[PDB]
Design a binder for these strands. Structure first.
Length: 620
RNA sequence: UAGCAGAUCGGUUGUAUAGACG
RNA sequence: CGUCUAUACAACCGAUCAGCU
C-alpha cells in the first residue's frame, strides 16, 4: 500500500487563458508569451493555451489584455480572464501541471508520461544505466475523490547519450559500424531530451552532419547548430554526428538523445512492506519542505496526513496406450527421461502411460517434420511430443499447422530450456502431465464449486502485423461443469467490426463440444492498489475481496486473487458481465477466486480467469 | 515456445485538451 | 475530418529480467 490522497480544491477550479500571437521562429516563439509573465501576476502559474487554471470559481466566457515577449519584443496577446467552467477532463490536467510547477520547485524531472525526482538518484554505472528513484505520479480521479498514485519506479534513463553510443559503435569499426547500424540500430528507438519525445530509426544519413542546412520553419538555409542553440537553448558540442531518420528528414541528431541490480533488487526497489517508507517519506517531504510547500499553499494543494494434487487421484485421467515422440537426434535423453519421469508422476495422478513408439526426425530444421511426421502418424497414434532446443516461431507453427488447422488433434510441444532444470523436472512433468491430459480431453482437478453453467473461455487477440492479420493466439475454453475439460482452439476469421458474429463460431465450436459431452447447455491490468471496505489494513487485500462502490474508479469490480511474495500486491481489475441477470457480485468475486485456481499449468493461484509469513525481517 | 508473482524497456493502436495545414 | 502536432490520460502487445510449483 503506497497510495496517498491529495485533498484541497476538490471542485470549482476555473481557468484563465493565454493567447498565442504571433508564432515567428519556433515552438519557443509561442511558448515565450508566458515565459516572461512574472511581471504581471506572479510566478505560480501554468500555461497550456486557452486554459490558465485558477483555484477559484470566476471564469465564464472570454476577455483579452496585453503582455510582452523577450527575444524580439513584439505585440503579445494574453487573456488571463473568463474561459469556461469545470469539466471532468480538466482537473487531472491542471493538477498535473501543478505537479509540473512542483518539479520546477521540488526539482523533479519528467520522462515521457510521469514526473520523477532525480536530484539525488541511484547512480549505478555498471552498465551506463541510472535507475531514477522517482515515482509514477499518475494523479487522476480515484477512490472517492482524488488520489496520487506513487510507485517507486526505477525509471531506466541512461546517463550516456546517443553521442557516445555512436562513438563507441565507431570505435568498433567504420564499415562494420555502418553495417551493424543498418542491422542493430534500425528499428531501434532513441529517447529525446529537449521535448522528451520517442523517435524511431529506419536509416542513417551519411553525408549530413551538424552543419548542413535544411528548410527550417523560417524558410532559410540555416546551420544545424544554430537551430538547436536558438530554438531550445541547447548547445551542440561536436560537428561530426551523422543524422538519423524516423531522403525525407525527420528531426533527429545523436548529440542530444539517448537509447538503451541483482543485489539491489531486495533493498530499495520493490519490497512488499518496506516500500511504505517511500510512501511515508515523500508525503512528509511535500509538507515539511518550506520552499516546496509555500508554492503549493498558494495553489491550494494540501496532501493527506496519512495445490497438493500431485498425490491425490484425478477425476478422470485419459491414459496413453499408443503414442510417439518427435524428438530430434540431439534430444535422446530429453523427452525420454521426461517420459520415464512421466511414468512415475502419472500413477499418483490416476493414469498410466506405456512407453511410446520412439519415432524421430532426420534434421534440426523445418524440413524434417514435413516428411517424418506424416510417414509415421496414423489414427492409431494418440500423442505427438515434439521437442527442439532452438525455438523459432515459423518452425514451431510449421509443426503446429499440420495438427490444429486441419482437424482437432492434441499436440504437445516442448523446448530444451523447459527440461534442463532438474529440481523442476518433477514439477515440469506434473504440469505437462496435466497439460497433455487436458489436451487428451480428460478431466483434471476441480474445486468446491457452488456454481454451474459458467464460461471460462479466455479470448486472446494476436493483432501484430497487418499482413498477418489472422488473430491466432488461442481460444481456450472449458466444456464441463467442473472446469476440468480444457480443449483449446483458435480463431479462423479476420474482420474489424463484424468480429462479434464470427468470433461466435469458436464459441459455438466450444458450446457444441459442451453439448456433445455434457448434453446440457451451460481488461486485466492496472496500476492500482486496493484498500478494501472491510477492515482498514493498508496491506494485501484478502483473496476474493469485494469492492465495487466508493473504493474504486467505477461500478466495475476490482478483485484480488493473485497472491504475492516478492513485491507489493497489484490487484487485477475486471469488467462486468451483467448487473441484471441475477449474478451477485460476491459470487462473481468467488467465481474469479475459484477460477483463479483452474488454469491448468500451475497448481495454485494465477492472476486472471482465462500466507502467514513476512512478519519479522525477511532478508535480514 | 511446460504456466506463472514482481516489475523494466520499447512499439502501436488508442482517449482527452486544444492549434495549424484545405 | 486526411495530415502534422505539443500537453497529458489510458490500454494492449512484444520482449527482458530482479522465479511462489
Amino acid at each position: 500500500a503506497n497510495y496517498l490522497p491529495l485533498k484541497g480544491n476538490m471542485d470549482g477550479v476555473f481557468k484563465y487563458a493565454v493567447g498565442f500571437n504571433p508564432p515567428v521562429e519556433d515552438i519557443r516563439s509561442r511558448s515565450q508569451l508566458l515565459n516572461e509573465h512574472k511581471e504581471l501576476i506572479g510566478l505560480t502559474r501554468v500555461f497550456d493555451g486557452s486554459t490558465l487554471y485558477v483555484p477559484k470559481r470566476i471564469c465564464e466566457q472570454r476577455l483579452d489584455l496585453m503582455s510582452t515577449r523577450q527575444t524580439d519584443g513584439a505585440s503579445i496577446k494574453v487573456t488571463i480572464s473568463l474561459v469556461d467552467s469545470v469539466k471532468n477532463r480538466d482537473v487531472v490536467q491542471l493538477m498535473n501541471v501543478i505537479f509540473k510547477r512542483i518539479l520546477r520547485s521540488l526539482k523533479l524531472q519528467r520522462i515521457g508520461r510521469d514526473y520523477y525526482d532525480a536530484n539525488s538518484p541511484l547512480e549505478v554505472p555498471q552498465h551506463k544505466m541510472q535507475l531514477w528513484p522517482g515515482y509514477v505520479t499518475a494523479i487522476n480521479r480515484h477512490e472517492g475523490g482524488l488520489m496520487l498514485v506513487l510507485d517507486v519506479s526505477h525509471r531506466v534513463m541512461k546517463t550516456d547519450t546517443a553521442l557516445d553510443f555512436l562513438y563507441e559503435l565507431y570505435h568498433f569499426n567504420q564499415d562494420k559500424f555502418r553495417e551493424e547500424a543498418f542491422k542493430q540500430l534500425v528499428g531501434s528507438v532513441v529517447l529525446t531530451r529537449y521535448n522528451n519525445r520517442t523517435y524511431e530509426i529506419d536509416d542513417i544519413a551519411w553525408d549530413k552532419n551538424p552543419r548542413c542546412a535544411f528548410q527550417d520553419h523560417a524558410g532559410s538555409q540555416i546551420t544545424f547548430v544554430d537551430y538547436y542553440k536558438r530554438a531550445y537553448d541547447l548547445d551542440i558540442t561536436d560537428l561530426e554526428q551523422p543524422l538519423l531518420i524516423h531522403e525525407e528528414m525527420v528531426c533527429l541528431v545523436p548529440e542530444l538523445c539517448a537509447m538503451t541490480m541483482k543485489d539491489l533488487a531486495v533493498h530499495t526497489r520493490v519490497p512488499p512492506e518496506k516500500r511504505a517508507e517511500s510512501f511515508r517519506k515523500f508525503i512528509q517531504r511535500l509538507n515539511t519542505t518550506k520552499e516546496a510547500s509555500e508554492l503549493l499553499h498558494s495553489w491550494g494543494l494540501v496532501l493527506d496526513s496519512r495445490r497438493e494434487c500431485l498425490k491425490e487421484h484425478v477425476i478422470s485421467a485419459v491414459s496413453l496406450l499408443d503414442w510417439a515422440v518427435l524428438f530430434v537426434r540431439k534430444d535422446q535423453g530429453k523427452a525420454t527421461d521426461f517420459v520415464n519421469m512421466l511414468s512415475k508422476v502419472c500413477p499418483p495422478i490416476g493414469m498410466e502411460v506405456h512407453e511410446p513408439k520412439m519415432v524421430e526426425v532426420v534434421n534440426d530444421r523445418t524440413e524434417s517434420y514435413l516428411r517424418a511426421l506424416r510417414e509415421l502418424i496414423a489414427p492409431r497414434l494418440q500423442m505427438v511430443v515434439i521437442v527442439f532446443p532452438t525455438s523459432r516461431d515459423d518452425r514451431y507453427s510449421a509443426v503446429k499447422k499440420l495438427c490444429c488447422i486441419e482437424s482437432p488433434i492434441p499436440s504437445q510441444v516442448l523446448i530444451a530450456r523447459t527440461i534442463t532444470q532438474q529440481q523442476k523436472l518433477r514439477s515440469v512433468a506434473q504440469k505437462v502431465a496435466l497439460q497433455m491430459n487436458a489436451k487428451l480431453g480428460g478431466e483434471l482437478w476441480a474445486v468446491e464449486i457452488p456454481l454451474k453453467s459458467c464460461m471460462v473461455v479466455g479470448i486472446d487477440v494476436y493483432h501484430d502485423k497487418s499482413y498477418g492479420n489472422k488473430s491466432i493466439a488461442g481460444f481456450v475454453a472449458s466444456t464441463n461443469p467442473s472446469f476440468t475439460r480444457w480443449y483449446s482452439r483458435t480463431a479462423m476469421q479476420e474482420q474489424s467490426q463484424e468480429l462479434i458474429h464470427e468470433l461466435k463460431l469458436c464459441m459455438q465450436a466450444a458450446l457444441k463440444k459442451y453439448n456433445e459431452m455434457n448434453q446440457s447447455l451451460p481488461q486485466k491490468r492496472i496500476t492500482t492498489r486496493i484498500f478494501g471496505r472491510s477492515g482498514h489494513s493498508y496491506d494485501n487485500p484478502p483473496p476474493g475481496v469485494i469492492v465495487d462502490h466508493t473504493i474504486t474508479k467505477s461500478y466495475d469490480f476490482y478483485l484480488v486473487s493473485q497472491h504475492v511474495r516478492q513485491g507489493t500486491v497489484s490487484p487485477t481489475y475486471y469488467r462486468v458481465i451483467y448487473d441484471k441477470s441475477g449474478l451477485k457480485p460476491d459470487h462473481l468475486q468467488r467465481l474469479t477466486y475459484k477460477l483463479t485456481h483452474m488454469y491448468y499449468n500451475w497448481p495454485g493461484t494465477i492472476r486472471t480467469p482465462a500466507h502467514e509469513l513476512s512478519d519479522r525481517l525477511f532478508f535480514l
